[PDB]
């Protein structure tokens, strides 16, 4: 099964240039003694490929960006025993991609005339034309539309016959002008009904497998299927049909599929994905662990831990990542109940804002905000810039079921990068949590307890066979958390106290008992 194929190793996560300018910089760091056998997985963000906008997620092609990465870096990571996780950004390609450039060059004669989505074609007979030339969907359709920005998800482009056409653009765009020249970049949505797109998916899977990929992340997968009259967020059954088709291709290359979906807990999308034998991200744990630590109570976190076991959910969990801390994910959806009460989520957002966080909301086409979505902040800052809270969150993360993803910047306890978040010309508030580190930063960090203590726990989690065995929550009062893994005679026990923020890790292996602890 695919869930069972998810490797249970600790997974590093970073941009190829997060450490000393390029992926060779991360390799050199990984070759240090402190990092020996720390990670068996590495999710390298998509700027490892040729790309422009959205720091890697506007893909030109899936060859490596030679400024930042090479096949020699991948061989060096394989030498270290590190398997790879990469994106397939299957919902869209850059305007600068060869497919879209061919569309702009040959227009209606292009072999890719059906590869992307002409907006006015898509909505033909389902809306009135705006003065600007684009089709405004009828109110019945526009209401249902899930929107990741104000206005419509369209970019106007220039075809070789001199016409201006509107192409579907759910996410980023850039429009530059001077004298007579209008240039544009953007993430142009792919037509999932096109056999050419599916041929590109298969070739891309083969390319990623050749690079040494073991996991392929289906970026923004819920947005792929589009249909007049639907919301275009996880449309069904269309989204399931696309996923099963990808699954087949994935299996032919020996790859594990991990669809990225920020569904509200109360929709139970994560349960449906798991029941269909797909691993999922754990976007509930980040907020739950903050709430558990901020309140010194395990009640909400334990409930979610119990459902992972009861529902047999294979996850990739995390503290921070390249996006913000998910908060909408904790809600109950349209009718259901969330993992934290609405009021508890909002109060957590307020605290995170007091700690320098910056909220990121969702807005409908009519401009009215729908809800908070994420909170942009480093996890170190989200926890009040306390080494003890970050050590505790890491320890809990490593003992919860699931593959633990480690954000490079949390490993080095980076605080909010306020300067980067406000810099004119930067990517905005997500920069608060994307600081690039030098080799010097790395060195100085390897003398810090907050970095070394995390690495000691990481190396244990990545190597001990205990975590390949049975998981158990040892009953305690609600201010403590005692998590136990046993594989035959090998036992790993986390005994944590949320009130005092103290904890110890006991590891029994080959009759030898060693204790990890960072307070005494």
Residue numbers in the entry: 5 to 524
From the study:
One of the most well-studied GPs in that regard is sucrose phosphorylase (SP; EC 2.4.1.7), which catalyzes the phosphorolysis of sucrose into α-d-glucose 1-phosphate (Glc1P) and d-fructose. Instead, a clear preference for sucrose 6F-phosphate was observed, making it the first sucrose 6F-phosphate phosphorylase (SPP; EC 2.4.1.329) ever reported. Crystal structures of the two SPPs were determined to allow for a comparison of their active site.
In this work, we report the expression and characterization of an SPP from Ilumatobacter coccineus YM16–304 (IcSPP) with active site sequence motifs that are different from the motifs found in TtSPP or in the phosphorylases with other specificities in the GH13_18 subfamily. In IcSPP, the inner sheet immediately flanking the barrel is considerably larger and formed by three strands instead of two. IcSPP also has an additional set of two strands constituting a third, outermost β-sheet. IcSPP seems to exist as a monomer, whereas TtSPP in the crystal structure forms dimers. In IcSPP, they are found at Asp223, Glu264, and Asp327.
